[PDB]
Design a protein around this nucleic acid. Sequence first.
DNA 1: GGTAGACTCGGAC
DNA 2: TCCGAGTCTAC
Length: 252
Amino acid sequence: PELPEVETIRRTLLPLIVGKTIEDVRIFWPNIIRHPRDSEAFAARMIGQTVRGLERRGKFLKFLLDRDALISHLRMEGRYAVASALEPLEPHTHVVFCFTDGSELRYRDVRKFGTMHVYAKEEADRRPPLAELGPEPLSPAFSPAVLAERAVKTKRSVKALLLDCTVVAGFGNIYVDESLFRAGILPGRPAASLSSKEIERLHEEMVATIGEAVMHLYVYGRQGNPCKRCGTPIEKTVVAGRGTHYCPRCQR
DNA sequence: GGTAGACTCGGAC
DNA sequence: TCCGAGTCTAC
Ligand SMILES: [Zn+2]
């Protein structure tokens, strides 16, 4: 799921788990657990804690318990569900948090690609994977000036810059391509080659694109199809190690 | 210390 | 054989 979908999960999952107390934690694929390193320690430490809140940072979900925070990243296909302990599990269920009320929070992932880290709450923001995360794209802390400062300092492409989690939190491939299209900037342009005007416009379109999504596509996945603005066939290439979609006429 | 490469997966191709 | 998010490893 991308940032808007993670926000939807945050909002919808919270009332389904708040105030529930963890009775057991069952782990069927230990490699998902990244901290503590031993999955048995991860399970043991969560027992007896009550869920107090659920926050989002970029695409990370931060489950707030009594003492600990559980930091979860779903990557491309990870999913959470709340359901009865009496019912059979769905396929690809890797971690289950069992509550005292006979309900469960279940983590599934066909790709087995997601991650979980647990730390004392006061520690979580200074440890991986949250340490060094850049500002929320919809926050005043992500500004044209912040973006300009990062862009001038790098040799990388503008696409590479926007995909960098230290620059801006959880701005995914789809939204990078869409924002660059809407701003009229080629993804392969060196970040340092962007004018002040281009940086301002890019910031504006990033906020608009992801803001709209949290509340249709021009380029992403539309290679070979006509651009919706000018009719030129959308092209796809590799930029910053990712499939990258753009209109060669609208973007410069 | 900035930046690329390795690493994790399994469904689609 | 391709893909990819974000951390870890190595130049
Ligand atoms: Zn166009």
